Design a protein around this ligand. Sequence first.
Ligand SMILES: *CCC1=C(C)C(=O)N/C1=C\c1[nH]c(/C=C2\N=C(C[C@H]3NC(=O)C([C@H](*)C)=C3C)C(C)=C2CCC(=O)O)c(CCC(=O)O)c1C
Ligand SMILES: *CCC1=C(C)C(=O)N/C1=C\c1[nH]c(/C=C2\N=C(C[C@H]3NC(=O)C([C@H](*)C)=C3C)C(C)=C2CCC(=O)O)c(CCC(=O)O)c1C
Ligand SMILES: *[C@@H](C)[C@H]1/C(=C/C2=NC(=C\c3[nH]c(C[C@H]4NC(=O)C(C=C)=C4C)c(C)c3CCC(=O)O)/C(CCC(=O)O)=C2C)NC(=O)[C@@H]1C
Ligand SMILES: *[C@@H](C)[C@H]1/C(=C/C2=NC(=C\c3[nH]c(C[C@H]4NC(=O)C(C=C)=C4C)c(C)c3CCC(=O)O)/C(CCC(=O)O)=C2C)NC(=O)[C@@H]1C
Ligand SMILES: *[C@@H](C)[C@H]1/C(=C/C2=NC(=C\c3[nH]c(C[C@H]4NC(=O)C(C=C)=C4C)c(C)c3CCC(=O)O)/C(CCC(=O)O)=C2C)NC(=O)[C@@H]1C
Ligand SMILES: *[C@@H](C)[C@H]1/C(=C/C2=NC(=C\c3[nH]c(C[C@H]4NC(=O)C(C=C)=C4C)c(C)c3CCC(=O)O)/C(CCC(=O)O)=C2C)NC(=O)[C@@H]1C
Ligand SMILES: *[C@H](C)[C@H]1/C(=C/C2=NC(=C\c3[nH]c(C[C@H]4NC(=O)C(C=C)=C4C)c(C)c3CCC(=O)O)/C(CCC(=O)O)=C2C)NC(=O)[C@@H]1C
Ligand SMILES: *[C@H](C)[C@H]1/C(=C/C2=NC(=C\c3[nH]c(C[C@H]4NC(=O)C(C=C)=C4C)c(C)c3CCC(=O)O)/C(CCC(=O)O)=C2C)NC(=O)[C@@H]1C
Lengths: 72, 72, 175, 175
Amino acid sequence: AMRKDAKAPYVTVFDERDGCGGPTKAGGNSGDNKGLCVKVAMKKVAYGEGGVDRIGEMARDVFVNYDKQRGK
Amino acid sequence: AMRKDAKAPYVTVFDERDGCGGPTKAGGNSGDNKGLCVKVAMKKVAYGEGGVDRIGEMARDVFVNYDKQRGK
Amino acid sequence: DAFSKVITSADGKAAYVGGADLQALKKFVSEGNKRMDSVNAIVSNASCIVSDSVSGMVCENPSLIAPNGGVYTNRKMAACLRDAEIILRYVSYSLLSGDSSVLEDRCLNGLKETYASLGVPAAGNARTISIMKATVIGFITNNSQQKKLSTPAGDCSALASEVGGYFDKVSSALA
Amino acid sequence: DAFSKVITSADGKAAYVGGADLQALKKFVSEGNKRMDSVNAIVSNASCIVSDSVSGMVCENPSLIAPNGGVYTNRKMAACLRDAEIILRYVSYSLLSGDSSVLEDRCLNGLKETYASLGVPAAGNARTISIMKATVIGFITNNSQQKKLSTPAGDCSALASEVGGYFDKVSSALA
Ligand SMILES: *CCC1=C(C)C(=O)N/C1=C\c1[nH]c(/C=C2\N=C(C[C@H]3NC(=O)C([C@H](*)C)=C3C)C(C)=C2CCC(=O)O)c(CCC(=O)O)c1C
Ligand SMILES: *CCC1=C(C)C(=O)N/C1=C\c1[nH]c(/C=C2\N=C(C[C@H]3NC(=O)C([C@H](*)C)=C3C)C(C)=C2CCC(=O)O)c(CCC(=O)O)c1C
Ligand SMILES: *[C@@H](C)[C@H]1/C(=C/C2=NC(=C\c3[nH]c(C[C@H]4NC(=O)C(C=C)=C4C)c(C)c3CCC(=O)O)/C(CCC(=O)O)=C2C)NC(=O)[C@@H]1C
Ligand SMILES: *[C@@H](C)[C@H]1/C(=C/C2=NC(=C\c3[nH]c(C[C@H]4NC(=O)C(C=C)=C4C)c(C)c3CCC(=O)O)/C(CCC(=O)O)=C2C)NC(=O)[C@@H]1C
Ligand SMILES: *[C@@H](C)[C@H]1/C(=C/C2=NC(=C\c3[nH]c(C[C@H]4NC(=O)C(C=C)=C4C)c(C)c3CCC(=O)O)/C(CCC(=O)O)=C2C)NC(=O)[C@@H]1C
Ligand SMILES: *[C@@H](C)[C@H]1/C(=C/C2=NC(=C\c3[nH]c(C[C@H]4NC(=O)C(C=C)=C4C)c(C)c3CCC(=O)O)/C(CCC(=O)O)=C2C)NC(=O)[C@@H]1C
Ligand SMILES: *[C@H](C)[C@H]1/C(=C/C2=NC(=C\c3[nH]c(C[C@H]4NC(=O)C(C=C)=C4C)c(C)c3CCC(=O)O)/C(CCC(=O)O)=C2C)NC(=O)[C@@H]1C
Ligand SMILES: *[C@H](C)[C@H]1/C(=C/C2=NC(=C\c3[nH]c(C[C@H]4NC(=O)C(C=C)=C4C)c(C)c3CCC(=O)O)/C(CCC(=O)O)=C2C)NC(=O)[C@@H]1C
């Protein structure tokens, strides 16, 4: 059921075939898919973290800029 | 001198006068200064952190979208 | 499978698949490479997609930010932006995995009833969802006008239709 | 003050100012409230400001991303975006503190020589800096067409001129 836990699957897709690698987190790094990795974590979607008020800044923006269209 | 360690002053200006407060880190969230705070740290400007490739994503965007003008 | 276990584990600690494990994983879903690019098109633009969608809900119905509107205060606006992101992330996982079972079970089952209990307006939710659907289809098909994505030349129409169906499951559950 | 000691401390760990201490901080600089709003305009929009500036450099000279180009690889483009952010952040601290001593000492002293040794081109830096200056001034002066700031109506012209002078110090040091 929807558990009211605000948890959601965070999927991150990495393509580092340019050669600038991030932290090693998976053991398979050789062959055709060298440089490619997918991560999934199941965690709370928080308003902010690490001192960074991510969603609060987005909220401030809506109130003042909802009349703007960032898609064009 | 410039130390070649990529450390810069991170200044964060908080205005939470809407009433939804973040974590308390100093006295004074009361009276005429309700909701206002300034933070400064001196730390490396990293390419990413916490698994989020912040500057790598910005670089990908430039390669494809340098002909776009996000200011209009 | 590695990822299914993340959904059900006690702490949701991240799992990672690269190289030969990822090659194997892509064999179990259709159009594996394009599918990864389609998922990336969602998650790498999560803030943009949520912002534009909630902003369009408000611009079409500014009473939502009038006093006693659904998102009048910053606290409520942020909760709404959060929920839109939660939904979007469950949709992204549906596209990664090729089905909607986790979305249905852990995001949708009980959600309409919770929103009724809270007084969260269904019309506003429907519009945030329909804009998120349109925005995601735009990014997947590289028809996003301010932010294109680099991918090998081709056609992602089938994956766009698939993701649209997952958004349609959200709409139908919340209507 | 306490923020000066953060700059010079061995570990740079954060300090915070609120309440009466924030009232005192604002007295010792001119136009304290508008100044805090101006610093906020810079740091809250740091990704946008840096992105538009470096993108402007590239669109005025697309050879920079072709093979044999100075930001051709992702690694180099990211180093350039990082450097633009470092400079912007030293400028933000100059506007917070009311002077440029830390910018000149810890960011600019030695930087022209370092870029010469690395082959970081002065003309590209000049354009990135000039766009960043114009962008920051635009944000501070209600000339940001895709992002309005919430501030009481009024005249921030002096603060825009001040921050312009800090950018001019960067330009002159790197020319
Ligand atoms: C995140 C960017 C942004 C938002 C959001 C917003 O509301 N304003 C924003 C940016 C902004 N940019 C400028 C000025 C300039 N930006 C550029 C680069 C773009 N022009 C291009 O030709 C190019 C590639 C094709 C770009 C990328 C340039 C060149 C300028 C002008 C600099 C100058 O010498 O004057 C501003 C300042 C206000 C303005 O509109 O000029 C702002 C706020
Ligand atoms: C971060 C946003 C973004 C970037 C960057 C980009 O390149 N594309 C982006 C978003 C995007 N939006 C849509 C479609 C819609 N967006 C809205 C909301 C805005 N329209 C308004 O009237 C309004 C208030 C002023 C907005 C805010 C709407 C309503 C839609 C269409 C919904 C529908 O039923 O059709 C897309 C899809 C592709 C396109 O450009 O049309 C994208 C990619
Ligand atoms: C309510 C849930 C809001 C929301 C607020 C958030 N604020 C966050 C970070 C933050 N806020 C302050 C200012 C506050 N603390 C003080 O001590 C004083 C005055 C003395 C004030 C005005 C600070 C200092 C911080 C950073 C904390 C730090 O340095 O670690 C924040 C991020 C929380 C976190 O990172 O853990 C949030 C979510 N955000 C929202 O979306 C709603 C509207
Ligand atoms: C080089 C400096 C680049 C850049 C790279 C970054 N990648 C970041 C995070 C990241 N990258 C991967 C994929 C990589 N790890 C693997 O094990 C495999 C395959 C087996 C690959 C292809 C992952 C998994 C991660 C997340 C790490 C995590 O979950 O903690 C990253 C953020 C670093 C961090 O969060 O500490 C960066 C900066 N970024 C750039 O700007 C240049 C171009
Ligand atoms: C719709 C989404 C796009 C479109 C996508 C295409 N991608 C194609 C090939 C391709 N993409 C990747 C990267 C992808 N695979 C992964 O495992 C991960 C990270 C974990 C990512 C980000 C790869 C490796 C490939 C194979 C070829 C290559 O190396 O470049 C592709 C070609 C057809 C196909 O391979 O099925 C397409 C069409 N292309 C578009 O034009 C729309 C907008
Ligand atoms: C140019 C930068 C803008 C402009 C800004 C104005 N701000 C004015 C007054 C004001 N701003 C704040 C918030 C500020 N002070 C803090 O301590 C902090 C956080 C630590 C911040 C974010 C306050 C508290 C005030 C006093 C008024 C109030 O109580 O809201 C202002 C009025 C003139 C003045 O007080 O000096 C202006 C013009 N306005 C513009 O049109 C440009 C775009
Ligand atoms: C945005 C398009 C909406 C809007 C959304 C609001 N949701 C509010 C609170 C809320 N949302 C949920 C569901 C969320 N939690 C989960 O665990 C999951 C899935 C795993 C989801 C999608 C819950 C359980 C809650 C209540 C508990 C909480 O706040 O975390 C909310 C605040 C309501 C209030 O406090 O009155 C809002 C504003 N509101 C709108 O008007 C648009 C249509
Ligand atoms: C962007 C507008 C430029 C551009 C910038 C590049 N800088 C590169 C390496 C680099 N930058 C610095 C200065 C930086 N480190 C600091 O500690 C401070 C201030 C405290 C700053 C401003 C250093 C010391 C270095 C080398 C060490 C490092 O990488 O951290 C760089 C990579 C060059 C290379 O590796 O060959 C670039 C691309 N490049 C351009 O084309 C535009 C004009």
